[PDB]
């Protein structure tokens, strides 16, 4: 190529960023998605409707592991979601090189938040439009931690982006509290998913994972159809 | 050899729920000492040391430089650090210069940071970790430590009669040595406390 | 370490010991000398071992790719290029024993060898590694022009037999290949 | 409208325009005609001097890139000239690295991907040319190719490329072309560009014939038209 | 909405789209042309036709199913440069697994690692994001048959029916209407459903000529390319 | 420094002796050379310690990224391939004796690695200082297709006439089983080698040295 | 690297940048300075503090050497970075020649680099 | 921004070699003059302020000991030429123990008089007069920024030059001599300048085969002015 290298995010005279506030909006309308941090573990929950019938649910998986401990999912494309999913599967296994220790989830969403600001500041291409909801039981506490195409972070006791992401978080915020286990935060991340969700919801329109202080689980359809068979 | 150029000898010994580490005070080229208050052991955070034994060159950029790493992380992240990190951290170091190596042996002295557990291991020149639970010793003497720590070594100790095996460990084998000498500084620490003594050894 | 390969009317007869040595402690009692590349195109290789595994599998990498990208059966002189480059531009540090052979649509049964020093040239029969000399003294005097296939397995069975029983870095086991039009028949001929 | 300018950009119903506008540029140019026969494939081009300025003989958009392959240029000359030359680039990559002559099938598609990265980027403009590409082996046949402006290729037994492209495969496909030798397809090439355009919008045109086969036992050269004449005391019999 | 310079570069539209790469889905609609993909059972079937209006024109170079490894086969649509070089791009990569990991690349992985280049021609601006389909097959061990999609977004995706190209709404809600139905899928149930789909998507019922079949089995997993004859038994075993 | 592998019926028996010398000096009594690479892949490392493990942990990260990428269960020969083209690379130069060993779908398979990258396919293979005596007993007393503990007491023997033999190890020699779903990591196997307690001792007082300067510290 | 000019020429022959770029030193703060016989004497005004703050570090007048004095106007920053530049190269000058560094070799060095830094691209 | 740095006219030559022949003009005036005497040459100041002290400004520059020069308009571009001809007439000696001549000095400025890039920065706007002793006696060469380079009998640039090439060629011949030279110079100086003319002014710069070094008059330059 030439690399021709200008950026093409520069400030406006109010003071913002447009590109940063369209990919933002982009987002927003994305598939909609909660996670929830309990006190003992982390419930991550996608909304997984396929456009027809045709389509299989075992090739594409939106829970993701980063490490034996780590789980991650998104709200926005998955060709860019599997770009930075490789980036940090790649960035998480050099920190495994160097100190040869499980990476906190601190240092997961520093290195990547900083590998997602270079791609907000750099020439010429275009941030990525995904929203991430990292997790891991680090060091027997749990950890919840939401970024941005802004290249920020946040972290949270719960959360929810996608459709009506408003609406499923006013929910959560009377719903859900302080304290509760794994399969009530599965439970009331549930109702907050088919709160917004469509009216066909099966074992394979949801894929949930866990994280457990033993380690992450991403959960089967199996126990799915255990679990969310009329869930209250 | 390049390794008995300036001398030098690092033992650390684990107790029961302390640690001991100590090394010699001489300084100077191959048959010429300069001076007797040359440093070779290291705070590395709190209750938790270093020793380099060999080439005091590498020695003193060896400590800068782990110094340098050790506090971008702890400044990256604001808990300290713990042992085994420190340790792979050394080996990657010194694995860094597979052909430019550094002449030194490290080894790393520190406690658990959560609990009251000691911490000894020794690392080569090219950065091969090896944890126990006795002693780890380093330098230009060797044979002379390992007869004496494997002589008196019991595997559950005061803090006292800790100091004191190590203390004539140090003593006799160090005044059985020839380059290395001209006192020994002893560092004895614990969970509640740091002590360093300073013993009188034969100044010949 | 005896390599050697023959050609005949329908196809080619390849064959070595296997006893990979290293001074006088043999590492490897039963050995793969012999490496398929294409289905159809064996090589057989010697002097060092990593170095022409190393080799071996570039030019698999090479010929399996221009062979799907022809979408035709690759040809032997195609293979014995490939290695005449790999072992010529770089040479200098590398010990290959390295004969080509196998059978061709176009062209029939093809032996050729690519010595330590990287040139090529198309034999009828060929010898390779250090324990080959003494067959090498007297496969001039035992082939005749235009055998069939059974002479030529007895051929190199009594050639490899002289060169295991003679020299002292062969011995072993003996691997044969017969390759023609039909298909590739491999047999191991041991005791 | 706005969106034509870009090499890089699509179109609001999904076309490249920049394309396109190549395809059209070598529309003008000369026309340029190929066949193959049953052991040989005849190229052809109907080829115009401006007045009296020319020497007939030279810049002949007949090309010769292999010993047994060479091209039919025709639309702008000198990107027709430079193509060629990463033509005999790349088959002098193929001699050199695999040691016998290049199939035809494979240097047409390193051939057709490098106009393609020609057409993909910015920087540069797609290419105003559009060639023939015609070869003989005695273990694969005669092969004739065609490539785009836009860098698709694939197999003809004819093609024509110029003016008259429909209006010489108009009756390029009546000709008997399996049972012909291409001693015969000599004054076929001949009364097909006579045919074409004799006297109507110009004043002169001339004739060049590109010829490779079993006859020349592979080799790639023009005809000695002169020898045999062909056209001309066939061309006077093919007005009537 | 157009704000800026949204209907040039990939930025970000208001609201949330961006207009170039879907200006690049229609891009395969400029192909004309229509590919099926049918796996029901422990075989895999292609289907896909010509369009060759010319005597002229060859039908070996024609065929749109190309081989990719002997264990995996796909078909393309769209233009067809940017198939090509998808394809080379494909085998390249292929072969690179074979070398770094030892043994043969599973479909999905490739499928995922092209998704990847296509998010690399994506993300950086000035490059055009080649407009082209790509569904592929192949058999995998434990798993069986396998289809997969490439997008030109590099949004894959890996389902039983499937159809892509210009007329596969229609053909997609015949796959709904189709596959609701639980029979087995006996390899000829395949390939007459994939016929008798085709034939009442375009509504023509016609030779076997103008169609390519592209197989591939768990009793034979290399890649199989049909013959006229086996494909004519077919198109009569369905004719009733 | 003597490691073993061996294949019976169902998977790979490995073993390993546990002295690590420097020079003249047994410098320690207890060194892991059974290192973790996977689930169903171990490896096993002699001669230059450090560079071993530097190489063992590269791959171990490798193959860990290159299974989170698939989702599925490594094959052997992916490690094959990625040791023998990295000690390619380095030309020799990086002195690695590794014996690499797992299940895979395809079953159990062994391999022997040479520093220079030479690889095998072998049903036992002896890396190391004292591996002729591993594999003097291997040679003496394999037959094909063995059962569980003929493995395990003969890989236990051959490592122990190793130790009768020169540069053993004091060590409870190490063992290790891999079958296709159980996977097992012994390192107290059996130790023939009981210290002898001293009838001493050398004993010593708190006060029978003097101190020139002291000092205190306290801590939190 | 950025393949764009700055510098165009105007229709009638001018410089977009330059001439122009002169205003927004005519909008700084103003400097003076003269040379006496023996007495070298300058300064600048407009301090502009707040009354209660610091201004020790806002100090526009520095030096680059024991013989030489500088003053700037303008923008700051970039007198920041040109006064760097040319304590480095006066410094070296110091390295290969033993003289004390003459303000002519010290000015051509200042009015070169700011000329090459207007010639370059972007 | 209206067809930049690398588009023609539809009609002539480029847009921005243009517009540095237009940009030459906002210079000072200088004039020199060739005699087989010996190059004579002289320039216009141009001083605004008492302030402005006369000797620092510098138009003839000294590129080797018979080697002058005047310049045009922009300053210090022309100065970065001057040094690096000096530099490559440096190398000339260097690698030949002889002098560069002033056709081949010039032919080494205009290899890069037009190398303007900046991908693959912007052309020069100075033109200049050169003046030497070759081997072939005196010589006046004059170039311009399109690099096209030229031998002028006595050339005059920057503003005012049609009527200072006009009232030149009233007074020029071939068989003149030196002072006459300069005094019919600096007439046309005084006739083009808007200020008195004075010893801060202008400058001289006189170079002969016999009188090779100090190619310059000082302030004998008054004698000269009070001639007239």
Same mark, same amino acid.
């Given at each position: 190529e030439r690399g021709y290298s200008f950026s093409l995010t520069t400030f406006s005279p109010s003071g913002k960023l447009v590109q940063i506030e369209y990919a933002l909006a982009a987002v927003a309308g994305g598939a909609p998605s909660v996670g929830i941090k309990a006190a003992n573990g982390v419930v991550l929950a996608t909304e997984k409707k396929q456009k027809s019938i045709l389509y299989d649910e075992r090739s594409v998986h939106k829970v993701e592991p980063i490490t034996k401990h780590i789980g991650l999912v998104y709200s926005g494309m998955g060709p860019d979601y599997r770009v930075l999913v490789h980036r940090a599967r790649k960035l998480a296994q050099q920190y495994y090189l160097v100190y040869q220790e499980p990476i906190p989830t601190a240092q997961l969403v520093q290195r990547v938040a900083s590998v997602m600001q270079e791609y907000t500041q750099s020439g010429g291409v275009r941030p990525f439009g995904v929203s991430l909801l990292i997790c891991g039981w680090n060091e027997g506490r749990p950890y919840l931690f939401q970024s941005d195409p802004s290249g920020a972070y946040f972290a949270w006791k719960a959360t929810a982006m996608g459709k009506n992401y408003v609406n499923g978080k006013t929910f959560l915020e009377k719903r859900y509290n302080e304290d509760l286990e794994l399969e009530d935060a599965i439970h009331t991340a549930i109702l907050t998913l088919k709160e917004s969700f469509e009216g066909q919801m099966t074992e394979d329109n949801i894929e949930v994972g866990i994280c457990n202080e033993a380690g992450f689980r991403r959960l089967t359809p199996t126990e799915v159809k255990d679990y969310l068979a009329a869930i209250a | 050899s390049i390794m008995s150029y300036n001398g030098g000898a690092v033992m650390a010994m684990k107790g029961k729920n302390c640690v001991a580490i100590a090394a010699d005070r001489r300084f100077g080229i191959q048959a010429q000492m300069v001076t007797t208050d040359f440093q070779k052991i290291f705070p590395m955070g709190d209750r938790l040391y270093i020793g380099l034994a060999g080439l005091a060159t590498d020695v003193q950029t060896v400590a800068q430089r782990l110094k340098f790493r050790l506090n971008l992380y702890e400044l990256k992240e604001g808990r300290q650090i713990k042992p085994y990190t420190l340790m792979s951290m050394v080996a990657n170091l010194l694995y860094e210069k597979r052909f430019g190596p550094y002449y030194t042996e490290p080894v790393i002295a520190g406690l658990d940071p959560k609990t009251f557990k000691p911490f000894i291991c020794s690392l080569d020149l090219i950065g091969c970790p090896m944890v126990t639970d006795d002693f780890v010793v380093s330098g230009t003497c060797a044979e002379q430590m390992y007869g004496m720590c494997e002589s008196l070594w019991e595997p559950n100790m005061d803090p006292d009669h800790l100091f004191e095996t190590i203390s004539q460990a140090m003593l006799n084998a160090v005044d059985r040595?020839?380059?290395? &000498?001209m006192g020994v500084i002893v560092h004895i620490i614990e969970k509640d406390k740091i002590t360093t003594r300073t013993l009188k050894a034969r100044m010949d | 370490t005896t390599i050697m390969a023959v050609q005949f009317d329908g196809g080619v007869v390849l064959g070595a010991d296997s006893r990979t040595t290293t001074g006088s402690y043999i590492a490897n009692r039963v050995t793969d000398k012999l490496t398929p590349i294409h289905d159809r195109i064996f090589c057989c290789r010697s002097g060092s071992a990593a170095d022409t595994q190393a080799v071996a599998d570039a030019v698999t990498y090479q010929l399996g790719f221009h062979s799907i990208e022809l979408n035709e059966p690759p040809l032997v002189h195609t293979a014995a290029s490939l290695f005449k480059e790999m072992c010529y531009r770089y040479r200098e540090d590398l010990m290959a024993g390295i004969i080509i052979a196998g059978w061709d649509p176009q062209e029939g049964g093809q032996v050729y060898s690519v010595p330590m020093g990287g040139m090529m040239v198309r034999q009828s029969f060929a010898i390779g590694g250090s324990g080959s000399s003494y067959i090498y003294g007297y496969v001039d005097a035992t082939y005749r022009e235009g055998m069939t296939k059974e002479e030529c397995l007895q051929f190199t069975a009594n050639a490899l037999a002289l060169a295991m029983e003679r020299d002292g870095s062969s011995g072993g086991v003996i691997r044969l290949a017969a390759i023609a039009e039909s298909g590739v028949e491999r047999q191991v001929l041991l005791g | 409208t706005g969106y034509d300018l870009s090499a890089s950009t699509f179109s609001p119903d999904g076309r490249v325009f920049q394309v396109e506008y190549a395809m059209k540029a070598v529309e003008n140019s000369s026309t340029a005609i190929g066949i193959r026969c049953k052991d040989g494939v005849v190229f052809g081009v109907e080829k115009l001097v401006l007045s009296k300025l020319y020497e007939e003989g030279s810049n002949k958009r007949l090309f010769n890139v292999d010993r047994h392959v060479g091209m039919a240029v025709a639309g702008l000359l000198a990107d027709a000239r430079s193509l060629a030359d990463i033509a005999r680039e790349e088959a002098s990559n193929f001699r050199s690295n695999f040691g016998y002559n290049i199939p035809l099938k494979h240097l047409a598609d390193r051939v057709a991907m490098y106009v393609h990265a020609y057409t993909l980027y910015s920087a540069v403009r797609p290419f105003g040319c559009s060639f023939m590409l015609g070869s003989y082996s005695v273990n694969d046949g005669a092969q004739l190719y065609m490539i785009d402006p836009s860098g698709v290729s694939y197999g003809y037994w004819g093609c024509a490329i110029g003016k008259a492209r429909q209006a010489a495969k108009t009756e390029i496909e009546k000709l008997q072309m399996k049972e012909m030798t291409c001693r015969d397809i000599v004054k076929e090439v001949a009364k097909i560009i006579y045919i074409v355009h004799d006297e109507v919008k110009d004043k002169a045109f001339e004739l060049e014939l590109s010829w490779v086969g079993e006859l020349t036992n592979g080799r790639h050269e023009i005809v000695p038209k002169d020898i045999r004449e062909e056209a001309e005391k066939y061309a006077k019999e093919s007005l009537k | 909405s157009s704000a800026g310079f949204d209907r040039h570069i990939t930025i970000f539209s208001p609201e949330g789209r961006l207009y170039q790469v879907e200006y690049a889905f229609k891009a395969i609609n400029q192909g004309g042309l229509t590919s099926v993909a049918v796996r029901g059972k422990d075989c895999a079937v292609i289907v896909t036709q010509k369009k060759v209006p010319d005597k002229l024109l060859d039908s070996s170079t024609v065929t749109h199913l190309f081989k990719i490894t002997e264990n995996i086969g796909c078909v393309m649509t769209g233009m067809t440069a940017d198939s090509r070089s998808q394809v080379q791009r494909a085998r390249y990569e292929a072969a690179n697994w074979k070398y770094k990991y030892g043994y043969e690349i599973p479909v999905d992985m490739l499928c995922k690692r092209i998704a990847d280049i296509s998010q690399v021609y994506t993300q950086?601006?000035?490059?055009?994001?080649? &407009?082209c389909c790509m569904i592929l097959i192949g058999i995998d061990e434990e798993q069986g048959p396998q289809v997969y999609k490439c997008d030109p977004a590099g949004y894959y995706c890996g389902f039983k029916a499937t159809a892509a190209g210009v007329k596969q709404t229609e053909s997609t809600s015949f796959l709904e209407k189709k596959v609701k139905?639980?029979?087995?899928?006996?390899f000829e149930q395949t390939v007459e459903t994939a016929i008798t789909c085709l034939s009442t998507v375009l509504s023509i019922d016609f030779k076997p000529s103008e169609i390519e079949v592209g197989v591939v089995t768990v009793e034979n997993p290399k890649f199989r390319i049909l013959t006229e004859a086996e494909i004519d038994a077919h198109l009569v075993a369905l004719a009733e | 420094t003597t490691i073993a592998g061996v294949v019976y019926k169902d998977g790979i028996v490995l073993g390993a002796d546990t002295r690590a010398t420097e020079g003249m000096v047994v410098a320690d009594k207890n060194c892991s050379k059974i290192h973790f690479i996977s689930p169903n892949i171990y490896c096993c490392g002699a001669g230059t310690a450090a560079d071993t493990d530097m190489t063992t942990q590269l791959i171990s990260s490798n193959l860990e990224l290159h299974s989170l990428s698939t989702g599925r269960l490594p094959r052997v020969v992916t490690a094959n391939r990625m040791l023998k083209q990295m000690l390619f690379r380095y030309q020799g130069y990086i002195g690695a004796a590794l014996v690499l060993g797992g299940v895979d779908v395809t079953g159990p398979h062994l391999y022997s690695i040479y520093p220079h990258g030479s690889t095998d396919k072998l049903p036992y293979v002896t890396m190391g200082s004292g591996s002729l005596a591993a594999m003097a007993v291997f040679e003496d007393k394999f037959r094909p297709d063995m059962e569980e503990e003929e493995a395990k007491n003969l890989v236990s023997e051959a490592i122990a006439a190793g130790i009768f033999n020169?540069? &053993?190890? &004091?060590?409870?020699i190490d063992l290790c089983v891999i079958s296709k779903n159980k996977l097992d990591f012994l390192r107290p196997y059996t130790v023939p080698n009981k210290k002898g307690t001293r009838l001493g001792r050398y004993r010593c007082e708190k006060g029978t040295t003097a101190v020139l300067t002291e000092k205190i510290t306290p801590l939190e | 690297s950025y393949d764009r000019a700055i510098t165009v020429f105007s229709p009638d022959g001018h410089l977009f940048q330059v001439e122009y770029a002169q205003e927004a030193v005519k909008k700084g703060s103003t400097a003076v300075g003269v040379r006496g016989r023996d007495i070298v004497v300058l300064g600048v005004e407009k301090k502009s503090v707040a009354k209660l703050q610091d201004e020790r570090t806002v100090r526009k007048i520095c030096a680059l050497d024991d013989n030489v004095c500088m003053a700037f106007a303008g923008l700051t920053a970039d007198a920041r970075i040109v006064i760097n530049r040319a304590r480095v190269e006066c410094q070296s000058h110091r390295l290969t020649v033993e003289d004390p560094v003459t303000v002519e070799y010290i000015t051509r060095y200042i009015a070169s680099l700011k000329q090459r830094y207007t010639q370059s691209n972007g | 921004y209206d067809r930049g740095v690398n588009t023609f006219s539809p009609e002539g030559r480029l847009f921005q070699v243009e517009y540095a022949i237009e940009a030459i003009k906002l210079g000072s005036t200088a004039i020199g003059i060739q005699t087989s005497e010996g190059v004579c040459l002289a320039v216009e100041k141009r001083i605004t302020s008492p302030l402005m002290e006369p000797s620092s400004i510098e138009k003839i520059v000294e590129i080797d000991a018979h080697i002058g020069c005047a310049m045009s308009g922009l300053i210090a571009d022309a100065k970065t030429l001057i040094d690096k001809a000096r530099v490559e007439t440096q190398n000339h000696w260097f690698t030949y123990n002889e002098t560069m001549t002033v056709e081949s000095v010039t032919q080494a400025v205009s290899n890069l008089a037009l190398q303007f890039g900046e991908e693959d920065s912007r052309p020069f706007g100075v033109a200049l007069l050169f003046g030497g002793v070759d081997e072939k006696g005196p010589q006046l060469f004059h170039m311009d920024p399109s690099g096209t380079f030229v031998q002028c009998d006595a050339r005059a640039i920057g503003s005012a030059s049609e009527g200072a090439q006009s009232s030149l060629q009233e007074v020029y011949h071939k068989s003149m001599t030196l002072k006459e030279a300069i005094k019919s110079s600096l007439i046309i100086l005084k006739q083009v300048m808007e200020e008195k003319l004075n010893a801060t002014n202008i400058e001289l710069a006189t170079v002969q085969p016999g009188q090779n070094f100090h190619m310059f008059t000082k302030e004998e330059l008054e004698e000269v002015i009070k001639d007239i």
């Open positions: - | 040595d020839a380059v290395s &000498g | - | - | 950086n601006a000035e490059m055009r994001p080649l &407009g139905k639980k029979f087995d899928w006996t | 020169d540069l &053993g190890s &004091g060590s409870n | - | -």
